[PDB]
Amino acid sequence: GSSGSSGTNWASGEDDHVVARAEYDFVAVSDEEISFRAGDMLNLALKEQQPKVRGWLLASLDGQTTGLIPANYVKILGKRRGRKTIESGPSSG
């Protein structure tokens, strides 16, 4: 079929998301899953958005398409906040 969605642009970075680097290699068992190798940056959506499934975190390897990716297989480096927030308004020291 076709696709199309706005707002939640965490995958692109415009929205709040997390950063992680695949610790090892792992392919996609199904179409829903994504194939990534050790050394890729995957954007993980906040639990709020995350699906019901447990263990698998919803993230977009490339940035446009989102799929189910493993956690242990990936290592978190340092979550980041939305992009707009960048030089948007005032903030404490």
PDB file of C-alpha atoms in Angstrom:
ATOM      1  CA  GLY A   1       0.000   0.000   0.000  1.00  0.00           C
ATOM      2  CA  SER A   2       1.007   3.607   0.627  1.00  0.00           C
ATOM      3  CA  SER A   3       2.319   5.610   3.582  1.00  0.00           C
ATOM      4  CA  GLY A   4       2.005   9.088   5.058  1.00  0.00           C
ATOM      5  CA  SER A   5       2.235  10.634   8.519  1.00  0.00           C
ATOM      6  CA  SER A   6       3.097  13.954  10.161  1.00  0.00           C
ATOM      7  CA  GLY A   7       3.923  15.307  13.605  1.00  0.00           C
ATOM      8  CA  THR A   8       5.821  12.473  15.270  1.00  0.00           C
ATOM      9  CA  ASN A   9       9.069  12.965  13.354  1.00  0.00           C
ATOM     10  CA  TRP A  10      11.334  11.420  15.989  1.00  0.00           C
ATOM     11  CA  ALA A  11      12.904   9.158  13.367  1.00  0.00           C
ATOM     12  CA  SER A  12      14.074  12.248  11.483  1.00  0.00           C
ATOM     13  CA  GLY A  13      15.188  13.904  14.706  1.00  0.00           C
ATOM     14  CA  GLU A  14      12.788  16.842  14.570  1.00  0.00           C
ATOM     15  CA  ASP A  15      11.111  15.254  17.592  1.00  0.00           C
ATOM     16  CA  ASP A  16      12.373  13.748  20.849  1.00  0.00           C
ATOM     17  CA  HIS A  17      14.218  10.457  20.348  1.00  0.00           C
ATOM     18  CA  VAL A  18      17.053   8.264  21.619  1.00  0.00           C
ATOM     19  CA  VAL A  19      20.432   7.342  20.135  1.00  0.00           C
ATOM     20  CA  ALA A  20      22.011   3.884  20.091  1.00  0.00           C
ATOM     21  CA  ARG A  21      24.828   2.060  18.300  1.00  0.00           C
ATOM     22  CA  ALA A  22      24.266  -1.547  17.235  1.00  0.00           C
ATOM     23  CA  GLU A  23      26.683  -3.549  19.385  1.00  0.00           C
ATOM     24  CA  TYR A  24      26.563  -6.447  16.926  1.00  0.00           C
ATOM     25  CA  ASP A  25      25.102  -7.477  13.568  1.00  0.00           C
ATOM     26  CA  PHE A  26      21.412  -8.361  13.308  1.00  0.00           C
ATOM     27  CA  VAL A  27      19.077  -8.852  10.345  1.00  0.00           C
ATOM     28  CA  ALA A  28      15.306  -8.434  10.099  1.00  0.00           C
ATOM     29  CA  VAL A  29      13.266 -11.596  10.654  1.00  0.00           C
ATOM     30  CA  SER A  30      10.213 -10.024   9.018  1.00  0.00           C
ATOM     31  CA  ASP A  31       9.260  -6.980   6.947  1.00  0.00           C
ATOM     32  CA  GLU A  32       8.246  -5.081  10.083  1.00  0.00           C
ATOM     33  CA  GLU A  33      11.780  -5.484  11.431  1.00  0.00           C
ATOM     34  CA  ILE A  34      14.815  -3.625  10.088  1.00  0.00           C
ATOM     35  CA  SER A  35      18.251  -4.917   9.094  1.00  0.00           C
ATOM     36  CA  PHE A  36      21.188  -3.065  10.648  1.00  0.00           C
ATOM     37  CA  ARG A  37      24.872  -3.817  11.221  1.00  0.00           C
ATOM     38  CA  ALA A  38      27.154  -3.085  14.175  1.00  0.00           C
ATOM     39  CA  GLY A  39      27.798   0.646  13.994  1.00  0.00           C
ATOM     40  CA  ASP A  40      24.474   2.215  13.046  1.00  0.00           C
ATOM     41  CA  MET A  41      22.528   5.048  14.679  1.00  0.00           C
ATOM     42  CA  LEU A  42      18.910   4.092  15.363  1.00  0.00           C
ATOM     43  CA  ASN A  43      16.348   6.588  16.658  1.00  0.00           C
ATOM     44  CA  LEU A  44      14.242   5.098  19.454  1.00  0.00           C
ATOM     45  CA  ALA A  45      10.924   6.754  20.299  1.00  0.00           C
ATOM     46  CA  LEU A  46      10.034   7.535  23.914  1.00  0.00           C
ATOM     47  CA  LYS A  47       8.141   4.834  25.808  1.00  0.00           C
ATOM     48  CA  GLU A  48       5.100   7.088  25.422  1.00  0.00           C
ATOM     49  CA  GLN A  49       5.148   6.379  21.685  1.00  0.00           C
ATOM     50  CA  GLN A  50       6.706   2.917  21.891  1.00  0.00           C
ATOM     51  CA  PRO A  51       4.238   0.120  21.035  1.00  0.00           C
ATOM     52  CA  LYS A  52       2.747  -2.425  23.437  1.00  0.00           C
ATOM     53  CA  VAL A  53       5.267  -5.116  22.498  1.00  0.00           C
ATOM     54  CA  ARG A  54       7.845  -5.815  25.205  1.00  0.00           C
ATOM     55  CA  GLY A  55      11.572  -6.233  24.645  1.00  0.00           C
ATOM     56  CA  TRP A  56      11.589  -4.720  21.164  1.00  0.00           C
ATOM     57  CA  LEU A  57      12.016  -0.956  20.818  1.00  0.00           C
ATOM     58  CA  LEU A  58      10.444   0.909  17.897  1.00  0.00           C
ATOM     59  CA  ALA A  59      13.190   2.729  15.997  1.00  0.00           C
ATOM     60  CA  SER A  60      13.992   3.829  12.445  1.00  0.00           C
ATOM     61  CA  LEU A  61      17.391   2.746  11.127  1.00  0.00           C
ATOM     62  CA  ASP A  62      17.466   5.083   8.127  1.00  0.00           C
ATOM     63  CA  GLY A  63      15.121   7.735   9.487  1.00  0.00           C
ATOM     64  CA  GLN A  64      12.024   7.524   7.302  1.00  0.00           C
ATOM     65  CA  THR A  65      10.764   3.995   7.955  1.00  0.00           C
ATOM     66  CA  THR A  66      10.336   2.668  11.493  1.00  0.00           C
ATOM     67  CA  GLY A  67      10.485  -0.951  12.611  1.00  0.00           C
ATOM     68  CA  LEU A  68      11.008  -3.299  15.548  1.00  0.00           C
ATOM     69  CA  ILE A  69      14.626  -3.519  16.699  1.00  0.00           C
ATOM     70  CA  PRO A  70      16.330  -5.403  19.561  1.00  0.00           C
ATOM     71  CA  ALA A  71      17.664  -3.702  22.690  1.00  0.00           C
ATOM     72  CA  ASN A  72      20.536  -5.854  23.953  1.00  0.00           C
ATOM     73  CA  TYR A  73      21.846  -6.006  20.386  1.00  0.00           C
ATOM     74  CA  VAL A  74      22.084  -2.215  20.565  1.00  0.00           C
ATOM     75  CA  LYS A  75      23.880   0.046  23.040  1.00  0.00           C
ATOM     76  CA  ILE A  76      22.678   3.474  24.168  1.00  0.00           C
ATOM     77  CA  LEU A  77      25.198   6.308  23.886  1.00  0.00           C
ATOM     78  CA  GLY A  78      23.124   9.285  24.987  1.00  0.00           C
ATOM     79  CA  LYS A  79      19.482  10.140  24.339  1.00  0.00           C
ATOM     80  CA  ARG A  80      18.763  13.514  22.737  1.00  0.00           C
ATOM     81  CA  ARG A  81      15.892  16.010  22.746  1.00  0.00           C
ATOM     82  CA  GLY A  82      13.894  17.364  19.821  1.00  0.00           C
ATOM     83  CA  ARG A  83      15.555  19.549  17.198  1.00  0.00           C
ATOM     84  CA  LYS A  84      13.263  22.583  17.311  1.00  0.00           C
ATOM     85  CA  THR A  85      14.075  23.019  21.001  1.00  0.00           C
ATOM     86  CA  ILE A  86      17.477  24.057  19.659  1.00  0.00           C
ATOM     87  CA  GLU A  87      17.795  27.804  20.233  1.00  0.00           C
ATOM     88  CA  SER A  88      14.005  28.021  20.475  1.00  0.00           C
ATOM     89  CA  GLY A  89      13.391  29.749  23.794  1.00  0.00           C
ATOM     90  CA  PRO A  90      14.948  30.712  27.147  1.00  0.00           C
ATOM     91  CA  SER A  91      16.491  28.133  29.479  1.00  0.00           C
ATOM     92  CA  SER A  92      18.183  27.941  32.881  1.00  0.00           C
ATOM     93  CA  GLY A  93      21.963  28.185  33.036  1.00  0.00           C
TER      94      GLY A  93
END
